[model samples]
Target: STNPPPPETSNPNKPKRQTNQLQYLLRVVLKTLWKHQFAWPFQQPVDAVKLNLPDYYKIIKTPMDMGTIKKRLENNYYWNAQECIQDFNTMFTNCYIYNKPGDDIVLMAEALEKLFLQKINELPT
Candidate 1:
């Protein structure tokens, strides 16, 4: 359950996404986020039912997570790196909206977002 979105994870009429520079860069950023110490909580979609947070779904229309984002990236669902980052941002943004400002999870989101921007900026493109 701790694996960082293994590369072993899918299609016919589909060229591998890694063939493009954008996808490689996006996946690179994804793996780094997956490896982050604060990544665990954000790794999977929130279990609203398990957490028993009725307001979670009421406020947050779409719940996003690092694992889901990784899967989507591998499936060639993103049009560009920005799309990947958008999902990443959404995952954190949902955190902020569902939790409070001082919450550790919210803090993790903030820090992870900073790391994401740094890595994406470091790209030569």
Candidate 2:
């Protein structure tokens, strides 16, 4: 019969690896930030009339812009999520200069999470 298996190689006194814990915590924090910072604000439909935008125009434009950015993210057109974030920043900055309200800002933030963060999570570790 084969000799008994050698004793386990793991060192009992060594610290356990914490990479899984770190990843778990990172995901949890990101999700929570997405929820409170982005999702909560867009829970209700944006009020175009209140924001002084044409209702139908805004309704059409928001999705169109979001779709364009999302397509880029899906295709990995950028080197990384930072580029996506920069694009979002540029768009939101223009909205602010154009006097878009908190509602619209939040909508873009929601789109950032949906488009960019979703793609990030799909990337291999």
Candidate 3:
């Protein structure tokens, strides 16, 4: 009979339809990145044809962008924080793989990756 007691609330659901805490925090982090000037190149999907980046699509098998992530967030695509973080990583990796060293977009991706990591570190692990 010494075991811990159950949660106070019998039902975990909320009446106000609040967004999940994790989603809220992650959304804040992502929106901050979107506002950064360096985030321009990573903000949306690269148009390989329109941009004349012939090998971009072929090299970047899984293209990712803040725009897509924003849409995903709206659609509740993330099951957990890790999924959201991984999407950002995938987006950064796509830029790293597609761009040459010291390229503007490549540097932007690197900077944004560090920025993301630093921001997410503030959240409880």
Candidate 4:
């Protein structure tokens, strides 16, 4: 049987790496973004039942607008039959928002931006 590759030798001259506050903050921010981005509205049972294609599109595009969300849920105006279920699955399973890496980061960023904006709106005006 072929032997495994030998372990890499440590480079003593290499500088010890440390995560600074800014880096730590950035990491936390990224994690938050990931969390929010992946936090699909349908994760809430009520919201999931309320989601329709059009309503979902609006929510996904805008994030906030509880009025519209409530209206849609009341009127049962959904963009599609399975919009919320699909979105929920994608968010949790695929980690569609912040779990993305490298090339997909842009898409994740955009999604997180919307979530962040919505969260800001949730704060006192």
Candidate 5:
């Protein structure tokens, strides 16, 4: 005869998973920050070091860093998340806002525009 069916295991009180909004925002900002384009030129040369190694280290490294940050955020690791945000804010202020205000401003402007459009669309027309 077959053994009795195993008991069902369930967690009715399990907390619902929530997305970390700040982390999500940072991921988008980091992905879209055009300043990285300019840095590649200078970064590659400096990162090349003495041995004439291929200059793709930074290219490979940056995404890995981003992935690490993302994973930490997903795991509810607050320290690195805060550090990442602070560093991103510094980058935005020093590089994007300072050197490429138009591009950086558009990022905020588009977000506001979408928000306003959604509010307007909600009104009975």
Candidate 6:
């Protein structure tokens, strides 16, 4: 998992987390991420190396796994493009400075959405 401490492990001693609640929250965040997909490209300039997209078109042709993406979009709590970008920016910036793989993407995306929404409301119509 991207998180330093993986989702709480199932410990018999500790109280069990509510799977249902977790799932519910997951769905909410994923939906938000998907909602803002147009502005968020799966591969940013930094993520190019990890993904191995050719430099020439890495910015445009970087392939993305829709299934995994859909899962994150369905479960992440992002609200807008700015949040989405920031989340990914931090994730890539912090990780390999070029790519964030696996669960780190999920954590960074979620965190970015939270940070973005904290200050602003829905965009003005």
Question: Highest lDDT: which candidate?
Answer: 1
Measured by TM-score, how close is model 1 to the native structure? 0.78
The TM-score values for the models, in the order shown, are 0.78, 0.33, 0.78, 0.21, 0.27, 0.29
What does candidate 3's lDDT look like per residue over 1-125, in tens digits? 12123112222252222245456544678888888889888776777766877777667667778877776666565556676678889888888887789998788888888988888886654
On residues 1-125, what C-alpha lDDT tens digit does candidate 5 reach at each position? 12222211223453323345445444544344324433232211122345353533423222212334344445444443344554333323333322344675445534433443343333221
Error of 6 at 36 (Å): 1.5
Candidate 3 residue spans exceeding 4 A from truth: 1-21
Per-residue alpha-carbon lDDT of model 6 for 3-80, expressed as tens digits?
A: 122121133453323233334333544345445643254323234444554452323232323233343334443344
lDDT per residue, candidate 4, 3-110, as tens digits?
A: 223222233453333223223222443235445643444232224233332333323322322233233333334333243223323333333432345545346545
lDDT of 3: 0.70
- Candidate 1 per-residue C-alpha lDDT over 1-125 given as tens digits, one digit per residue, 9 for 90 to 100: 12222222244444444435456555578887789998898887776666676567778776688877777776776556666677778888888888998988888989998988888886544
Displacement of residue 53 (Cα, Å) in model 1 is 1.6
Model 6 TM-score, all chains together: 0.29
In Å, residue 5's CA in model 4 sits off its true spot by: 34
- Residue 4: error of model 2 in Å? 75
What is the RMSD of candidate 4?
20.1
For model 1 the local lDDT of residue 62 reads 66
lDDT of 2 by residue, 1-125 (tens): 12222222234454433243234323552345445544443333334555555643433333213333444443444444454455545444444444445666656664655554554565334
Candidate 4 lowest-lDDT run of ten = 1-10
Please give the CA lDDT of all the candidate structures.
Answer: 0.71, 0.43, 0.70, 0.35, 0.36, 0.39
Q: Any runs in candidate 5 off by more than 4 Å, and if so which?
A: 1-19, 34-36, 39-81, 89-125
Per-model RMSD to reference: 5.7, 19.7, 13.4, 20.1, 16.6, 11.7
Ordered by TM-score, highest first, the candidates read: 3, 1, 2, 6, 5, 4
Better candidate by lDDT, 1 or 2: 1
